[PDB]
Amino acid sequence: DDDDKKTNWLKRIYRVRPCVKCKVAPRDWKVKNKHLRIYNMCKTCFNNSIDIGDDTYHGHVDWLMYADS
Amino acid sequence: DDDDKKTNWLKRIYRVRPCVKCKVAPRDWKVKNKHLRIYNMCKTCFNNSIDIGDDTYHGHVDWLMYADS
Ligand SMILES: Nc1ncnc2c1ncn2[C@@H]1O[C@H](COP(=O)(O)OP(=O)(O)OP(=O)(O)O)[C@@H](O)[C@H]1O
Ligand SMILES: Nc1ncnc2c1ncn2[C@@H]1O[C@H](COP(=O)(O)OP(=O)(O)OP(=O)(O)O)[C@@H](O)[C@H]1O
Ligand SMILES: [Cl-]
Ligand SMILES: [Zn+2]
Ligand SMILES: [Zn+2]
Structure with missing residues (x-):
């Protein structure tokens, strides 16, 4: 089933x-309508990046959660 | 750059x-607006599936080509 190909790929x-920062923990993410937003850092590193004043690693990649657009 | 993370992943x-049929050739694909459609079979296997009357492997998965939805 093509939706399963997409879901398996996202997993x-x-x-x-x-x-991208600690190289160990999984990334933070959220659901954004029909998209999965995978942020670049885990929550701990993201919160710390705000504390230390570094936006270098801020960002995310959005993924359509279904096989058909 | 987050768009590069998406492009590298799609590559x-x-x-x-x-x-999915011959297990060797790369898949057919097309660009569908802001999406890359990756079909399940190469063109040769898809055309042959029409000739032999098998729709088992028909299908595709669409991928947003950009990092931000
Ligand atoms: N864990 C994280 N790692 C890296 N960057 C992050 C993380 N969390 C948030 N960001 C960055 O913070 C910014 C805000 O993200 P967010 O997803 O909240 O955006 P949005 O589209 O404004 O949604 P909303 O306004 O509903 O919160 C973006 O630059 C995002 O990449
Ligand atoms: N190489 C291939 N391998 C597997 N399935 C394919 C292949 N090429 C086409 N298909 C299947 O054929 C059907 C038609 O695909 P197509 O992308 O042409 O759909 P569409 O949204 O109707 O676009 P259009 O009407 O503009 O051609 C879909 O079921 C698709 O998965
Ligand atoms: Cl996607
Ligand atoms: Zn981290
Ligand atoms: Zn083939």
């Missing part, structure tokens, strides 16, 4: 690329 | 999962 993408 | 996704 893999989320699993295999951890937080 | 990887396209590369690592060949045609």
Whole structure:
């Protein structure tokens, strides 16, 4: 089923690329309508980036959650 | 740059999962507005599926080509 191909891919993408900052924890994310937003950092590193004044790693990638647009 | 994270991922996704039918050739695809449609089969297997009367492998997965929805 093509929706399952998309879901399996999103599980893999989320699993295999951890937080860009600590390189260990999984990334924060949210659901944004029909999209999954995967932020670049875990929550702990993101909150810390605000404290330390670094926006270098801020950002996200949005993924359509379904196989058909 | 977050758009590059998306583009690099789409290159990887396209590369690592060949045609679901012959298991060798890369899949057919097209650009569908702001989406990349990756069909399940290469063109040769898709055309052949029409000739042989099998719709089992018909289908596709659409991917947003940009990091921000
Ligand atoms: N965990 C995180 N890691 C990296 N960047 C993040 C993280 N959380 C938020 N950001 C950055 O913070 C900014 C705000 O994100 P957010 O998803 O809240 O945007 P939005 O579209 O304004 O949604 P809303 O206004 O409803 O919160 C974006 O630059 C986003 O990439
Ligand atoms: N190479 C292929 N492998 C598997 N399935 C395919 C392939 N090419 C087309 N299909 C299937 O054929 C059908 C038509 O696809 P297509 O992308 O042409 O749809 P569409 O949204 O009707 O666009 P248009 O009407 O502009 O052609 C869909 O079920 C699609 O998955
Ligand atoms: Cl996507
Ligand atoms: Zn982290
Ligand atoms: Zn094939």
